[PDB]
Design an enzyme around this catalytic site. Structure first.
Site, PDB file in Angstrom:
ATOM      1  N   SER A  64       0.527  -1.100   0.290  1.00  0.00           N
ATOM      2  CA  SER A  64       0.066   0.222   0.081  1.00  0.00           C
ATOM      3  C   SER A  64       0.807   1.308   0.177  1.00  0.00           C
ATOM      4  CB  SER A  64      -0.741   0.087   0.718  1.00  0.00           C
ATOM      5  OG  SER A  64      -2.063  -0.772   0.707  1.00  0.00           O
ATOM      6  N   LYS A  67       0.643   3.180  -3.402  1.00  0.00           N
ATOM      7  CA  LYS A  67      -0.201   4.196  -3.574  1.00  0.00           C
ATOM      8  C   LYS A  67       0.237   5.835  -3.089  1.00  0.00           C
ATOM      9  CE  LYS A  67      -4.347   1.422  -1.437  1.00  0.00           C
ATOM     10  NZ  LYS A  67      -3.945   0.236  -1.030  1.00  0.00           N
ATOM     11  N   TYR A 150     -11.411   2.231   3.371  1.00  0.00           N
ATOM     12  CA  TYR A 150      -9.955   2.389   2.907  1.00  0.00           C
ATOM     13  C   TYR A 150      -9.841   0.768   2.133  1.00  0.00           C
ATOM     14  CZ  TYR A 150      -4.831   1.315   2.661  1.00  0.00           C
ATOM     15  OH  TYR A 150      -3.421   1.394   1.774  1.00  0.00           O
ATOM     16  N   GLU A 272      -1.162   9.532   5.487  1.00  0.00           N
ATOM     17  CA  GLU A 272      -1.284   9.886   6.163  1.00  0.00           C
ATOM     18  C   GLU A 272      -1.140  10.879   6.820  1.00  0.00           C
ATOM     19  OE1 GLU A 272      -2.757   6.191   8.235  1.00  0.00           O
ATOM     20  OE2 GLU A 272      -2.874   5.534   7.120  1.00  0.00           O
ATOM     21  N   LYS A 312       2.509   5.960   6.092  1.00  0.00           N
ATOM     22  CA  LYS A 312       1.772   5.285   5.831  1.00  0.00           C
ATOM     23  C   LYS A 312       2.745   3.926   5.906  1.00  0.00           C
ATOM     24  CE  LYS A 312      -1.677   3.677   2.682  1.00  0.00           C
ATOM     25  NZ  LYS A 312      -1.557   2.961   4.056  1.00  0.00           N
ATOM     26  N   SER A 315       1.688  -3.609   3.274  1.00  0.00           N
ATOM     27  CA  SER A 315       1.881  -5.064   3.484  1.00  0.00           C
ATOM     28  C   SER A 315       1.750  -5.685   2.029  1.00  0.00           C
ATOM     29  CB  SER A 315       1.152  -5.829   3.947  1.00  0.00           C
ATOM     30  OG  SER A 315       1.367  -5.010   5.574  1.00  0.00           O
TER      31      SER A 315
END
Ligand SMILES: *[B@]([O])([C]N1[C]=C(C2=[C]C(C([N])=O)=[C][C]=[C]2)N=N1)OP([O])([O])=O
Length: 358
Positions: A64, A67, A150, A272, A312, A315
């Site tokens: 992730s 992203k 999410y 985040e 962030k 996984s």
């Protein structure tokens, strides 16, 4: 009395090294950047069966954390005027024009507030036609823009739209435009034949070797692979956007802008965001099961902090990632493992090290 490089090494040994034994992790790469000085620490094996040690050439799956590159690509396209975040996907993917999904804007897709998109596509969705069919057949549930869930399909569709806006497939957007603009030399959507020798095995919870499975819109959601030096260069770009050309500088700054609140967590583009200084518990709460796995009503930002920090987690079945940076302190950290360890352990280890460094 002790050189800076050795003090950082000692802090990483105290806080990261014990996690290898505790969780039976074959290999780990931990990087710190402070004041444009990079520190790289490597532990254990990229491949248990090949007896290959983790090194600066080792390629890990980011999961992730991919992203963040999708978000950066979105920021780049917007500031070049190729997209607006108020646009709907039907404007670019014509086959979605005047469908229910065309009532969701690009910012809402990027920040997971469509109101009806889960973490994963159904297992059956694999081909481009099956992905198109899925979005054509999509119908709303929760009020659009109000609820954060999410979602890989959500930011995956954002990624695909960004790619259409730049008239290139998403893999080429990162490999030909975004990675080179960030000065990344060993970052891949598709690891080429000549680099497979540097591609670590992931290890599952039974320490069996595995790599990521292909999936629908995998590249924008969880499909990027990188080395510790590249990820430290990426953190450098995020800490010093002013040193990069205008187009990618604005792209990076776009990813830092908080869009809404879920309590103490500010959702930026991929990143985040938190008020700095942040407590350990604030950072841990950001990756609670409630926040990650369930829908949560968002609130408008009502307190914009002057000073922020960003992180962030990432996984895949066989890999764990954590990236964090603090502009005020001009510092950041990257952790790459070829086995998943609990998010809480990644966040805690990074917190102690970044707070201990002089
Ligand atoms: B992302 O990493 C969310 N996430 C996890 C996965 C994933 C994918 C595979 C696979 N082989 O395709 C296997 C396991 C897990 N995809 N997206 O964010 P966080 O919150 O850090 O999990």
């Amino acid at each position: 009395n002790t050189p800076k490089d050795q003090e950082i090494k000692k802090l990483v040994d105290q806080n990261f090294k014990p996690l290898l034994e505790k969780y039976d992790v074959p290999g780990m790469a931990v990087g710190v950047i402070q004041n444009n000085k990079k520190y790289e620490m490597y532990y254990g094996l990229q491949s248990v069966q090949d007896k290959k040690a983790v090194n600066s050439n080792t390629i890990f799956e980011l999961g992730s954390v991919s992203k963040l590159f999708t978000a950066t690509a979105g920021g780049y396209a917007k500031n070049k005027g190729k997209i607006s975040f108020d646009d709907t996907p039907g404007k670019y993917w014509k086959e979605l024009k005047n469908t229910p999904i065309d009532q969701v804007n690009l910012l809402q897709l990027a920040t997971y507030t469509s109101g009806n998109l889960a973490l994963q596509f159904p297992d059956e969705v694999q081909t481009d036609q099956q992905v198109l069919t899925f979005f054509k057949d999509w119908k709303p549930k929760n009020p659009i823009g109000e609820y954060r869930q999410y979602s890989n399909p959500s930011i995956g569709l954002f990624g695909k739209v960004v790619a259409l806006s730049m008239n290139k497939p998403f893999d080429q957007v990162l490999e030909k435009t975004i990675f080179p603009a960030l000065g990344l030399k060993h970052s891949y959507v598709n690891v080429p034949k000549t680099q497979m020798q540097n591609y670590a095995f992931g290890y599952n919870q039974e320490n069996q070797p595995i790599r990521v499975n292909p999936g629908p819109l995998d590249a924008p959601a969880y499909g990027v692979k990188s080395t510790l030096p590249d990820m430290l260069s990426f953190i450098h770009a995020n800490l010093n956007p002013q040193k990069y050309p205008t187009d990618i500088q604005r792209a990076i700054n776009e990813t830092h802008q908080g869009r809404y609140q879920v309590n103490t967590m500010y959702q930026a583009l991929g990143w985040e965001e938190f008020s700095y200084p942040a407590t350990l518990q604030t950072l841990l709460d950001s990756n609670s099961e409630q926040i990650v796995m369930k829908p949560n009503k968002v609130t408008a930002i009502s307190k914009e902090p002057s000073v922020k920090m960003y992180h962030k987690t990432g996984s895949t079945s066989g890999f764990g990632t954590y990236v964090v940076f603090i502009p005020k302190e001009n510092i950041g950290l990257v952790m790459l493992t070829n086995k998943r360890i609990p998010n809480e352990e990644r966040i805690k280890a990074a917190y102690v090290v970044l707070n201990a460094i002089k």
